[PDB]
Amino acid sequence: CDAFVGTWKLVSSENFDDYMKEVGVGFATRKVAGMAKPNMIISVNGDLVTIRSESTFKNTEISFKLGVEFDEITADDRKVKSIITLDGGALVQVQKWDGKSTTIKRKRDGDKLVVECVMKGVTSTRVYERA
Amino acid sequence: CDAFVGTWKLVSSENFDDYMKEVGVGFATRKVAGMAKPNMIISVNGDLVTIRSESTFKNTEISFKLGVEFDEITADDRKVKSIITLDGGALVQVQKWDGKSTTIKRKRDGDKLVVECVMKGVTSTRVYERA
Ligand SMILES: CCCCCCCC/C=C\CCCCCCCC(=O)O
Ligand SMILES: CCCCCCCC/C=C\CCCCCCCC(=O)O
């Protein structure tokens, strides 16, 4: 996933509070999240890919092998099972917990990285540019 | 309530989508409501006060006597019991339905009319100026 490696900074967000509401994130955490302008750092070492998100409030980091299910504790503190595959040049992540699931797709668009988050028909789009 | 009579147009809104989420309004109706810039028309005839809200999408109208509980069907189609009193120069409305309640306060602030909506600790503020 060489096209993804680097440090990226958030440029725009669309419908992310609606997505967080659908996931069940509480009011105060949604308000902190809408104030954060995270940096995303992606790196690869052998067959482990790492995605780190850094903000004043909370940093998250996951390291995984593409295709192997793993445990992840999300920024809003859900304990989920995640699997990320490389499909059509995009990193496609599915998180499952309590009989629910959500899909987070990270893809390149021009010189940007676009994150699309989908939960039961609500879709949010976040655009990042290279820092 | 002479200080309220007139036609008013929305100038700003703060946290109204969060208030609607707390009330239980669905995604599409919340999206229509956030696109509307309603006009509010208040008039008095004898002891009946009328508050009408007009938008491209939906008009609502309630007529009431201050202090007498009445039936109201809200813009998002809840059937509620409402009572509005005049307290401290503000119109204070309480709506009750299914064991829940929310308070909508309409007050003058300078040359503006301010609507404050409260549902379980989430507060939204909408400011109107004379049309
Ligand atoms: C005090 C907590 C501060 C941080 C709160 C962040 C809350 C985020 C909420 C839900 C996580 C959803 C999963 C991440 C989606 C991708 C976001 C992105 O990379 O832009
Ligand atoms: C197709 C429907 C179009 C209109 C949708 C409007 C939805 C409003 C949602 C909930 C009603 C809450 C009660 C009104 C609060 C006061 C609003 C105001 O006067 O500014």
In this structure, what CATH number is given to the domain that contains residue A70? 2.40.128.20
**Amino acid in position A60:** T
To test the pocket of ligand 1, the residue of A22, A25, A100, A101 to mutate (highest count of ligand atoms within 8 Å of its CB) is A25
For residue B60, how far is its CA from the centre of ligand 2 (angstroms)? 9
The resolution, in Å, is 1.6
Per-residue CA distances from A106 to A3, A25, A42, A112, A118 (Å): 11, 21, 11, 10, 12
Our answer on whether the CB atom of B25 is closer than 6 Å to any ligand 2 atom is: yes
Q: How was this structure determined?
A: X-ray
On whether any CB of chain A is under 8 Å from the CB of B27, the answer is yes
Token readout for B103 is: 């308070």
**What is the C-alpha to C-alpha distance for residues B61 and B9, in angstroms, rounded to an integer?**
16
Q: Is B22 helix (H, G, I), strand (E, B) or coil?
A: helix
Q: What are phi and psi of A22, to 5 degrees?
A: -60, -35
**What is the C-alpha to C-alpha distance for residues B41 and B53, in angstroms, rounded to an integer?**
6
C-alpha gyration radius of chain B: 14
H or E stretch covering A21? helix A16-23
- Which residues constitute the domain of residue A59? 1-131
**What is the C-alpha to C-alpha distance for residues A74 and A23, in angstroms, rounded to an integer?**
11
CB pairs under 8 A between A and B: 10
Tell me how many domains chain A contains: 1
Using an 8 Å CB-CB cutoff, list chain B residues near A21: 21
